[model samples]
Target chain A: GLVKMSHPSGDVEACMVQVTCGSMTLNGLWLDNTVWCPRHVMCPADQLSDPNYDALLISMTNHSFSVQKHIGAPANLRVVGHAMQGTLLKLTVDVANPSTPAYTFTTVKPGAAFSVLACYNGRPTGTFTVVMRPNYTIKGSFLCGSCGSVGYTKEGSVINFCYMHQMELANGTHTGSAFDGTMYGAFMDKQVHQVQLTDKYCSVNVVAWLYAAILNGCAWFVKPNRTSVVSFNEWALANQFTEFVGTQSVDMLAVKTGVAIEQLLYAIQQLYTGFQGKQILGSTMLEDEFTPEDVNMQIM
Target chain B: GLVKMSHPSGDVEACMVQVTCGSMTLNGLWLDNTVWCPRHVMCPADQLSDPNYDALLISMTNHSFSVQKHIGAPANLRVVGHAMQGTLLKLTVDVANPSTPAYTFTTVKPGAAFSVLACYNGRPTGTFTVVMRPNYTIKGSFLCGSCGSVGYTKEGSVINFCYMHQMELANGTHTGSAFDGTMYGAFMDKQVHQVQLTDKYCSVNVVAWLYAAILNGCAWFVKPNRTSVVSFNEWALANQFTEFVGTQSVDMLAVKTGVAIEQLLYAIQQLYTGFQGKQILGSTMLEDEFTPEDVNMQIM
Candidate 1:
């Protein structure tokens, strides 16, 4: 089936799209004539390709947005308009297929406030609030896995976000944050807060910062055995809590963890300077599955 | 050439044989009817086989020791007897042919005090003294690279020795020792002294203990790049003094150092229990090259 929606502005503005796949609905973004949705919305999460998501470009002609049903797409899946207060500028999804139950999706409009609940295998795993600011910037707030209440801020057209976590060390834990964003589609900057140390040797934090880098899609050093969010979380917890003898180097850590040197450097860079040291092309953001609660549960 | 020597006792006792290879003379032991010599005495050190030495068994008949010249052996090389004081039972090498320079070798005799100098490529590098006690136990004393003056003791029918080194750590240095010897050819024990710690995290030592294990022939985890004593010493020096932020684990250190887990465990086991945790059959001792001065120079 084909559906067309006309925008009064004659140009498709930045907006959100709620995509329903199987028994769950996930937040998708519609900007620059492309519909960006999590890969699980189309293919099974386990079978999804790298970057673990799908970005489909929509056809824009004569001040109208139009899309055709993709392969394996559900029947009766169509875009519709939603009226809020006195404005009718909101977009939504409607499914009328008899085999699939009806679900009321939140309206996706500029400056709209909505809740994004992560669902894994038909069960809600975590919930957070996302707000599209008046200036088109995105801000999200939620409890990050053992990091407690934390948030992320994203801006511009690049597909990147910024967040922080608690660095658990032998001496004590410290809160560290980073901003991973791109500028003008060509340059990216990763700024992280410095962590103060009380004990130089025992207080060197490795796993937490490494986990943060992994969540941010800097995966050059992630081993095959620890590619999944769950597996990495388990491995990180086992080592993070276990005591060590002395300080470690990125190169040695790479050798020890069976990860690549570049990836470990990326992780260490995050711990040292708040910046994503290098830009990795086609890396997937795993933040959705690696929720703050998930991290917190393991460390706790 | 073929040579035969008969012992008056009708049983060949344990004795030492000096083997002249090219421009170098190394200590060779004659025990249990077998001659054990450094592999470099025959094959070039770089091209030498594993266990880096040669062990040849002599044919014994009518209370006589008879052996023919091995392939590639010097034409004048032959075993002869040396008489000192009232004892006429010491074995010595006599090279009479012309092409090689004549070198005066110390006579192999029980209760004789002599010096064993290590030579690389024709240049004398380090010197040490070896004293064979009345009961046939071997004791050696030498300046171990930068580790200062130290000694090693060896006993039994097994080819093993025990020594100690100064562990240079970040906060301070400590003297640590280990005994790597075998019992009954089936059981081996490595006993090491406990290293006192002043700062738990910063003072946790890694490189020294690893070097100790390497010198002792526990090399299951050594990476190819670090297989050479020189390369490992350089790498260890570069990392040992460089400050790290925190403590590290054996598994992680293995990854970082590009070594095997078993080898790392072997090293850590030395640190923890001072025992050569696992016995590696056919492993070669590297202590001949990894002198205390070599290690101490790098750290200093």
Candidate 2:
């Protein structure tokens, strides 16, 4: 098929192209498919210029809440993937009913501690405030008009406002190789902040999020998996990789028993102990070199 | 025309250089003009070794616990994706399966956890034992065996035998990570000499590993953003010769953001609380003066 690409001058040229999308770089061709040019692809979403989410009013003093007003957005919020810059992304919650106040927070790597904040109406109502950094995941715990306080994910289950929390929390919590399967650099800070949290519960606020936490007993114990962009690399590996890592365990067992390893180590250590003592007690020398036999070991 | 590596003893006239500047010994080939063999040119079956791998069995207790065996190489072990020797690896349990005994333990990173021993033949039996121990040069615990213990480019999983303990051990206590001191903690050790407390038929005549401490633990507790060794690309950033990791987060966000990365980061911070005060402590610090005295405080 014939394709066209514009130049710096906005002049389009006829070319045979496939417009192949990938994880990192994008490749396109000029006149012929052979004349290839590549460009670095950006993050997978374009969320700037967002005003659909508004902070709502929830007066906790009287446990009263109200939806002030509703805001609408372009029907097509769906965006294309591209590099981004300093652009605000906003979501709002209309808390007009008289009720409890709300709270919110954000996360970069899913889990860890979130930048939670108390919010009133559309402004912040907390001791601390946070903003998003260039690179990270976003999440928050919101006290929704319906659902008390709850975390977020991409999946929809609780109230629609509470849904933002999960959408931001798509990956769960705390990102690392420890148990999350995610790894970070040696010096990079892998934590997310508070605005992301507000962005999460711009609807439900914090009361609902907190309430959900209490019901769970140990909300802090809940850590979700940080999500990495599903790239072609991952998709490829899932298809191409196989397991053969355990091939040698059987062979090793065939030769040396694990217990023998400890004994041998003990015996070797005893040789060193005897080195300082220089004993000529024959068989007993090797035996007594290391104290208390296998009886001294507790294997469970 | 000329060949040296092709034949074990074929080199002579062409590639050979005369010792021009220094005196030499029977084993000495020093100086600026010294000629050496390329790594790929080494002999295949000579006394020389390749890839530098050594495997030795340490112990095995017939799916039960036994201490009479011997410790050989690093024991039943396998190396994957350029694994280093003696690198300590953790044991993964398959408790869901009925074939083996089950126990509980947690890897440092917190991964899948299950019963270490299994109910065998309608009775509890210690058929498989796994352990985490330092091997030749490989340091396990999240270390990429294929990529060393810290980083490797390839991705894969490795399984190893557990440090099989028959029961409350003879050593009677925990020394370090190893429970060699807790001699016979397993119910099978009831038959051993002084273990009269254990039921003769229900618990005696066998060695055992205490199926408590880690037997009921969950999988690895990894961070959310980062991935565990099992799914991470140890070699993704730093190459065999270079230590450069590509940016995946902000960079990805930039693309989805459709703005300059910095701007995207800034906006993300504004719209979402999760990104602020994460990596860069002071968002305003960039404009603040550098503190020479504060910088001079060194821990070293």
Best candidate (score: DockQ): 2
TM-score for every candidate vs. truth? Answer: 0.17, 0.16
Residue B8 in candidate 1 has what lDDT? Answer: 13
Give DockQ: model 1: 0.01
Tens-digit lDDT string for candidate 1 (B1-300): 000100011011112234453443444333323333322233333443332221211221212322223212222234554211110112344543221211222223232222232222212222343332222233331222222112222222122322222222222222222222111112111222333322211112344335444444455645433233333334434433212212244334444445553344234323333223233222111111222222232211
| Residue-level error in angstroms, candidate 1, position A114 | 62
Model 2 chain A — which ten-residue stretch has the worst lDDT? A1-10
Best by lDDT: 1
Highest TM-score: give the candidate number: 1
Q: Local error of candidate 1 at A8, Å? A: 82
In model 1, the runs with Cα more than 4 Å from the true position are A1-258, A270-300, B1-76, B81-91, B95-300
Q: What is the lDDT of candidate 1?
A: 0.28
Model 2: per-residue lDDT, tens digit, A69-121? 11111111111222211111111122222211222222232111222222222
Give a tens-digit lDDT track for model 1, residues A20-104.
5443344433333333332223333344333222121122112222222221232223555321111011223453222121122
Q: Candidate 2, residue B9: CA error in Å?
A: 50
State each model's TM-score restricted to chain B.
Answer: 0.20, 0.16
